[PDB]
Ligand binder design. Structure first.
Ligand SMILES: Cc1cc2nc3c(=O)[nH]c(=O)nc-3n(C[C@H](O)[C@H](O)[C@H](O)COP(=O)(O)OP(=O)(O)OC[C@H]3O[C@@H](n4cnc5c(N)ncnc54)[C@H](O)[C@@H]3O)c2cc1C
Ligand SMILES: NC(=O)c1ccc[n+]([C@@H]2O[C@H](COP(=O)([O-])OP(=O)(O)OC[C@H]3O[C@@H](n4cnc5c(N)ncnc54)[C@H](OP(=O)(O)O)[C@@H]3O)[C@@H](O)[C@H]2O)c1
Ligand SMILES: O=C1CCCCCO1
Length: 529
């Protein structure tokens, strides 16, 4: 039983920064934990081939330390998993953080002790810590989703989830199946196709994707970025999604067809999924006709790329362009390869997995050495629901969030005093590092304020929390993303109640809300002295 000021759960971007603020700016005794053997979070787990950010390299990082920003370098316009991991290990060493963390150590329970006004946190090695504050940075795309298939456990080959890819494992020369064609599946398929002996893709919902445009960067282009870094970050912080481009306000149907095509073509040539969805016109996410113009443009490209009409039919995206926008380094062109087969599982479902592979309902065995599951995540709330977390009077997080998960401001919830979340439910949907920093900075200020002012507990009221839920819901219902049927609204997991899970007002609005709450003496919080 060690006693400390603060516990941080997670050693991704969130947890790394939170330990830094709580320790060096607030002078609090702070311990961090990760199940992982080192820092990096997402970029520690997802070592699958092709893993690559869709935020441009110069913005997928911390902004808080002006010297670090001048020191870091990168090879290309987007940054790969090993490069991000190295960046994060460098942050941890640069700021002497490593000593706060217990790696290979899962937090298994966190229990609030009403009389003592402390959290009791236990690890899977039986260590017990008591803390005044808990900061949860457990990842909104971290709890793996791994569907059961009939017969899966008779399979004699290897099975791998992409977000648990063992470092070093290569599938070169093997016969491989991939289940999943979201952001991960596209990357893994594109990068496996040239090295595997045969690839079979099991596609349930083909998605819309545009080119990433990942180009080599020399040490000069990067010099110009580094020379304007202050303004770069100021604009990012004052945009909606903080991806580094100007979010358009131009309505798509207010220009001619010719011009519309030209604007989409320029975005397509330039690259980037978010730029396609938000850099071109201002209403692709809120107006049906604007959505359909963007969708048709992409469908027409698929048609020109994939040469076999039957293959193209199976890969043709349909319906609203309303999932997380995807981009790729040659995904659709993979299906022109003779060692790649697409299996459209909505029309030819999986019958079962047997010793040697996957059998479809047409009676064909797809013979496979390895099955890769790019089946995504129990997003946002999944890592909370899996830990034993109990608040005031032993209320379990799963009974508190008995239906949808909720927060006040994305960083707190009622009945859990002195307990904060980084990227909890109902927070911003943006390039995430600058949102993580907004939240960590705001939590650190709040804890600092509590310590200075002798506050014993802070927690949001149920009224404020309900208002925040309603605000998220209203903003969501004004967009088409409601009908996209993906992880973003909890619709990807059998047994998960679909719900709003994000505040979609953008980083500029989010930051203004957060700063006003703090300037106003923590409006919506109950504060006990
Ligand atoms: C393949 C991939 C690509 C992505 N690309 C982008 C992108 O381009 N742009 C973008 O903005 N976002 C992207 N994301 C989202 C990305 O997760 C965030 O950018 C960011 O890495 C989140 O960092 P985090 O610290 O909040 O959580 P994570 O990096 O998910 O770290 C959470 C950590 O908590 C640990 N943990 C959880 N529960 C426990 C427990 N009980 N005890 C101990 N440890 C625990 C986990 O092991 C994990 O290491 C991507 C995600 C994935 C999976
Ligand atoms: N920066 C990047 O380039 C990058 C890369 C990877 C991940 N990410 C982030 O991580 C998020 C999640 O991405 P992801 O691709 O891992 O997950 P995802 O978008 O949730 O996609 C999961 C895929 O698995 C399929 N699937 C799920 N269950 C299945 C089942 N039982 N049988 C057959 N198919 C099944 C889904 O089909 P349906 O659509 O039919 O459900 C979908 O194609 C992304 O949206 C993005 O935010 C980003
Ligand atoms: O890939 C990501 C993570 C989901 C939320 C913002 C979009 O960028």
């Amino acid at each position: 039983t060690h006693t400390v000021d603060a516990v941080v759960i997670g050693a991704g971007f969130g947890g790394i920064y939170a330990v830094h603020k709580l320790h060096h700016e607030l002078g609090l005794t702070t311990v961090g934990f990760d199940k992982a053997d080192g820092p990096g979070g997402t970029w520690y787990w997802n070592r699958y081939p092709g893993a690559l950010s869709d935020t441009e390299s110069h913005l997928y990082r911390f902004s808080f330390d002006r010297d670090l920003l001048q020191e870091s370098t990168w090879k290309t316009t987007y940054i790969t998993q090993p490069e991000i991991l190295e960046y994060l290990e460098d942050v941890v060493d640069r700021f002497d953080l490593r000593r706060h963390f217990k790696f290979g150590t899962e937090v298994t329970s966190a229990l609030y002790l009403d009389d003592e006004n402390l959290w009791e946190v236990t690890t899977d090695h039986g260590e017990v810590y008591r803390a005044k504050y808990v900061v949860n940075a457990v990842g909104l795309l971290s709890a793996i989703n791994f569907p059961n298939l009939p017969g899966l456990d008779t399979f004699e080959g290897e099975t791998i989830h992409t977000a648990a890819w063992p470092e070093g494992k290569s599938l070169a020369g093997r016969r491989v199946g991939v289940i999943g064609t979201g952001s991960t599946g596209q990357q893994v398929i594109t990068s496996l196709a040239p090295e595997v002996e045969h690839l079979t893709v099991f596609v349930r919902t083909p998605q819309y994707s545009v080119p990433v445009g990942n180009r080599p960067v020399n040490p000069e282009q990067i010099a110009e970025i580094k020379a304007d870094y202050d303004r770069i970050w100021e604009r990012a912080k004052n945009s909606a999604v903080a991806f580094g481009f100007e979010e358009s306000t131009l309505p798509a149907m207010s220009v001619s067809e010719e011009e519309r095509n030209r604007i989409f073509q320029e975005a397509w040539d330039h690259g980037g999924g978010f730029r396609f969805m938000f850099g071109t016109f201002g209403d692709i996410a809120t107006d049906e006709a604007a959505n359909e113009a963007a969708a048709s443009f992409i469908r027409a490209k698929v048609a020109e790329i994939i040469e076999d009409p039957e293959t193209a039919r199976k890969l043709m995206p349909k319906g609203l362009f309303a999932k997380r926008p995807l981009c790729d380094s040659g995904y659709y062109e993979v299906y022109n390869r003779p060692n790649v087969e697409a299996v459209a599982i909505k029309e030819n479902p999986i019958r079962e997995v047997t010793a040697k592979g996957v059998v479809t309902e047409d009676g064909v065995l797809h013979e496979l050495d390895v099955l890769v599951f790019a089946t995504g995540f129990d997003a946002v709330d999944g890592n909370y629901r899996r830990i034993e977390i109990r608040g005031r009077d032993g209320l379990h997080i799963n009974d508190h969030w008995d239906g949808q998960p909720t927060s006040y401001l994305g960083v707190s919830t009622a009945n859990f005093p002195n307990w904060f979340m980084v990227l909890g439910p109902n927070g911003p949907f943006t390039n995430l590092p600058p949102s993580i920093e907004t939240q960590v900075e705001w939590i650190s200020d709040t804890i600092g304020y509590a310590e200075r002012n002798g506050v014993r507990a802070i927690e949001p009221t149920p009224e404020a929390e309900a208002e925040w839920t309603e605000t998220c819901t209203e903003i969501a219902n004004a967009t088409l993303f409601t009908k996209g049927d993906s992880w973003i609204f909890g619709a990807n997991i059998p047994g998960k109640k679909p719900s709003v899970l994000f505040y979609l007002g953008g980083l500029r609005n989010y930051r203004a809300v957060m700063a006003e709450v703090a300037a106003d003496g923590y409006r919506g919080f109950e504060v006990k002295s």
